[PDB]
Design a protein around this ligand. Structure first.
Ligand SMILES: Cc1cc2nc3c(=O)[nH]c(=O)nc-3n(C[C@H](O)[C@H](O)[C@H](O)COP(=O)(O)OP(=O)(O)OC[C@H]3O[C@@H](n4cnc5c(N)ncnc54)[C@H](O)[C@@H]3O)c2cc1C
Ligand SMILES: Cc1cc2nc3c(=O)[nH]c(=O)nc-3n(C[C@H](O)[C@H](O)[C@H](O)COP(=O)(O)OP(=O)(O)OC[C@H]3O[C@@H](n4cnc5c(N)ncnc54)[C@H](O)[C@@H]3O)c2cc1C
Lengths: 180, 180
């Protein structure tokens, strides 16, 4: 059982996981391993990452960062999603995981949104400003919701943005993850 | 003498500057030095920066990243902005700086939006999906256009997103900064 299952382990999904975990939520990231930044030998435009590491290295750091605060990240290709009336049952080849909320950071892959019959905006998932889809308790971020042309920092930022509003919705008040 | 003048040198402005500069544009960032993240002793939630640097250090790294690819970043408070000869004239300590486009990454400060008569949306500047304001060739990003609750990665991502669409507008074609 999880508070939130994030489908997609690219920049948007891993960034969302970091924020959700820091908000005290039990979060699991299920990733199919096809992030578009994976083959990049050097990412020179992720503001602040001055060593301009490879896409694989970027993803490794993002995963490490999310785990540092409690997030779980596991390889997995979701092939099914069932609304059980209170919780979503997400199925991969390994089995099933349950969560009250879903956050789709699946790039352009229509698999997830089609299983849920989500309303679309062009070839992407339709959402309101904060990332809420047509289906209650289902959110979307990054390229999945039209933040294109896609870029790593754009997706990472949107993943955090949608996560922050998911937390705000859950808590019943504005959520800010600010340090001193 | 500038393709774009970015007002505000916080995460959104510096991220936008990095992308604009990498697009080959002449970009100038004028910053008042009041970034909200500057006082943080340790930023623990900027996806990927595992060393969790102070807000001051983060800003220095973002500035370095933008300068690395050609952006000029300097202290300065923008108070006067006129539209003449098809370009925006900005008064500065070094004389008038002219630009074809203006990008406001000024957080919640309503001073410039009010002077320019920009259409508002709540406590922020109204924009379309890509960051275009009600004033042609004037864009906005980050907290300035309502990406709140504000966070460094959220503003950095939005700055890049708006910059990418600004370049797309300038070139008349979807722009992408991807490694080959
Ligand atoms: C050749 C190329 C070069 C690029 N170079 C750059 C560059 O230099 N700089 C830059 O900033 N951007 C670059 N990009 C773009 C960048 O990689 C993307 O913008 C970024 O990866 C988008 O992040 P995202 O989280 O939205 O999606 P992605 O990182 O693509 O992640 C989507 C994830 O969801 C998973 N997923 C989808 N469906 C399922 C499912 N059913 N079950 C489980 N998991 C699923 C995928 O396997 C994947 O890991 C490049 C892209 C390409 C194609
Ligand atoms: C106490 C505190 C703690 C925080 N801790 C965190 C944290 O741990 N993690 C996190 O992710 N976020 C944190 N934040 C929020 C984070 O700092 C903001 O989300 C981020 O700085 C927003 O970036 P921005 O680019 O939108 O605006 P800002 O960084 O606020 O930058 C706006 C910039 O524009 C300049 N400017 C405005 N008007 C003008 C003008 N007329 N001429 C020239 N320059 C102008 C300002 O001087 C400023 O430098 C914190 C905020 C506060 C207040």
């Amino acid at each position: 059982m999880w508070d939130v299952i994030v489908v997609g382990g690219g920049p948007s999904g891993l960034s969302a996981a970091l924020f959700l975990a820091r908000a005290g939520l039990k979060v699991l990231v299920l990733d199919g391993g096809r992030s578009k930044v994976k083959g990049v030998s050097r990412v020179p435009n992720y503001p602040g990452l001055l060593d301009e590491p490879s896409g694989e290295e970027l993803l490794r750091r993002l995963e490490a960062h999310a785990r540092r605060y409690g997030a779980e990240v596991r390889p997995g290709v979701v092939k099914g999603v069932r609304d059980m009336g209170g919780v979503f049952e997400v199925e991969t080849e390994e089995g099933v995981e349950k969560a009250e909320r879903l956050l789709l950071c699946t790039h352009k892959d229509p698999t997830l949104p089609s299983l849920l019959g989500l309303t679309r905006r062009g070839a992407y998932i339709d959402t309101d400003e904060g990332g809420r889809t047509s289906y209650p308790r289902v959110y979307a971020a990054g390229v999945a919701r039209g933040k294109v042309p896609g870029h790593a920092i754009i997706s990472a930022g949107d993943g955090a943005y949608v996560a922050v509003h998911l937390v705000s919705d859950l808590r019943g008040e504005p959520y800010k993850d600010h340090a001193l």
